[PDB]
C-alpha cells in the first residue's frame, strides 16, 4: 500500500517526537583519586580498572 495523502506538519511532528534517546543515569566513582561519573552497570568494572576513563 502507498500513502494516499501527504502528511500535515502537525501529524508528522507528533509522530516524529517519539524517536528520541534517553539519558543514562550516572553515579560517582573514585578511580586513581579523582571523582568521575560512570553508569551504575559499570561500577564494579570501574572499581576493578577495566573501563577506560578519558
Amino acid at each position: 500500500a502507498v500513502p494516499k495523502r501527504r502528511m500535515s506538519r502537525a501529524n508528522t511532528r507528533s509522530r516524529r517526537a517519539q524517536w528520541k534517546a534517553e539519558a543514562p543515569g550516572l553515579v560517582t566513582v573514585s578511580v586513581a583519586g579523582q571523582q568521575r561519573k560512570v553508569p551504575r552497570r559499570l561500577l564494579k568494572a570501574a572499581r576493578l580498572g577495566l573501563v577506560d576513563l578519558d
Binding site: R41, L42, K44, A45, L50, V51
Partner: protein, 118 residues
C-alpha cells in the same frame, strides 16, 4: 546444562557448540577473556561443569573433558593446576563483569574470569 531458550549463539547449534568449546579453551588458557555479555552468560555453566570434571580428576573425567576441549595443553593445565586450586570451593569458579559497549555495533561486552581469592 540448560539449553538456550531462543536462537542459538553462532547461528546454528553446531556453531554454538564449537563457540562454547573455543571460549572455554581460551578462558582456561588465559584466565580471563572479554566477549559479548550473552556469550559469557552462556559460557559460565559450561566452563564450570568442565572445571567440576577436572576437580575429581580421574581418567574417566579426563576423557569426559577431552571429548569437549580438543586442546591438550589446556587439558593438562586444567587437570594439574585449575582442578587442584578449586579443590575446596563448591561451585562459583568464575565471575562475570560487565564492561563498556563495543563501538562498531553497540554490543554489550562483559569479562568472564576465574576466581582467585582463596
Amino acid at each position: 546444562p540448560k539449553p538456550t531458550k531462543g536462537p542459538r549463539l553462532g547461528g546454528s547449534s553446531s556453531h554454538q557448540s564449537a563457540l562454547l568449546a573455543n571460549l572455554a579453551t581460551s578462558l582456561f588458557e588465559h584466565g580471563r577473556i572479554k566477549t559479548t555479555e550473552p556469550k559469557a552468560r552462556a559460557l559460565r555453566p559450561y566452563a564450570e561443569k568442565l572445571i567440576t570434571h577436572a576437580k575429581k580428576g580421574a581418567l574417566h573425567n579426563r576423557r569426559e573433558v577431552m571429548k569437549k576441549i580438543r586442546d591438550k595443553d589446556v587439558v593438562h593445565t586444567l587437570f594439574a593446576e585449575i582442578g587442584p586450586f578449586y579443590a575446596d570451593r563448591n561451585g562459583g569458579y568464575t565471575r562475570i563483569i560487565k564492561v563498556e559497549n563495543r563501538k562498531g555495533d553497540n554490543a554489550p561486552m562483559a569479562v568472564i574470569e576465574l576466581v582467585r581469592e582463596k
